[PDB]
């Protein structure tokens, strides 16, 4: 069943170097039995870790999903990580206990729609980047802030509210 926002955040490693929840990509990959440098040589795209981080947060909160990257070490050995943001989002949307996301087609709609709520956000098709970004979002003052980074410069914003 659907996790509380604070529990999910507590199991989520921010990729924002200035965040109190920060953990670097080398340490993130090491936890699941991968060497960052090996992965980067296969594909530079592995440097983008938002979906890796979200996958891990989901596992740590007992949420089921299919991933492509097998976990080699630690508590979740035998489970899988989904390293692609869109693929992970598509799965949470099409087939999970989060249910279907609310879909916004522009940033103003997304900002008004999310409002004072918190939960999981997916930024679909970011300007100047071939892909998206999945993260946690919550209000701070009267602005929305993401655990790692917000990308409202995108085609669509998907949102799953958490309590």
């Amino acid at each position: 069943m659907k996790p509380l926002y604070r529990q999910l955040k507590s199991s989520h490693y921010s990729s924002d170097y200035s965040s109190p929840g920060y953990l670097a990509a080398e340490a993130v990959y090491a936890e699941i039995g991968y060497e960052l440098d090996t992965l980067l040589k296969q594909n530079p795209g592995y440097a983008n870790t938002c979906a890796v981080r979200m996958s891990l947060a989901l596992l740590k909160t007992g949420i089921s999903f299919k991933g492509r990257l097998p976990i080699k070490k630690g508590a979740y050995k035998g489970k899988t990580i989904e390293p692609g943001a869109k693929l992970l989002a598509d799965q949470l949307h099409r087939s999970s206990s989060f249910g279907k996301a609310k879909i916004f087609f522009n940033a103003p709609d997304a900002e008004k729609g999310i409002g004072n709520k918190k939960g999981v956000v997916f930024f679909n098709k970011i300007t100047n980047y071939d892909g998206g970004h999945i993260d946690l979002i919550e209000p701070e003052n009267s602005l929305l802030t993401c655990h790692s980074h917000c990308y409202f410069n995108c085609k669509e914003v998907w949102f799953w509210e958490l309590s």
């Binding site: 990729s15 924002d16 170097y17 440097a47 938002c50 980047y129 071939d130 892909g131 970004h133 980074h149």
Partner: protein
């Protein structure tokens, strides 16, 4: 050292950049990230590749990690070439 980052701070040392880059003041951190943006735009597609493959948060993380592991002696070098080195060595154009 430099007190706070301004557009007049040419030949910005690595140590000063890295201080502003980590600032608790959100406007100061943003200014440092904009200095970075200028360096990124000046070097992307030339010494390192590339925007289509790498998010800005990704670029920012790897720049931080490079600076964070840098021997203290190298922080006297100019911020821009250090940033360039960080990305050129991990994400070369192929």
């Amino acid at each position: 050292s430099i007190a706070h980052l301004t557009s007049d701070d040419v030949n910005l040392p690595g140590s000063d950049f890295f201080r502003f880059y980590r600032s608790a003041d959100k406007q100061e951190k943003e200014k440092a990230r904009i200095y970075l943006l200028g360096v990124l735009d000046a070097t992307e597609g030339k010494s390192w590749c590339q925007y289509s493959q790498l998010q800005t948060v990704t670029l920012q993380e790897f720049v931080f990690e490079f600076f964070n592991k840098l021997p203290a002696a190298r922080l006297h070098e100019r911020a821009a070439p250090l940033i360039e080195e960080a990305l050129a060595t991990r994400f070369p154009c192929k």
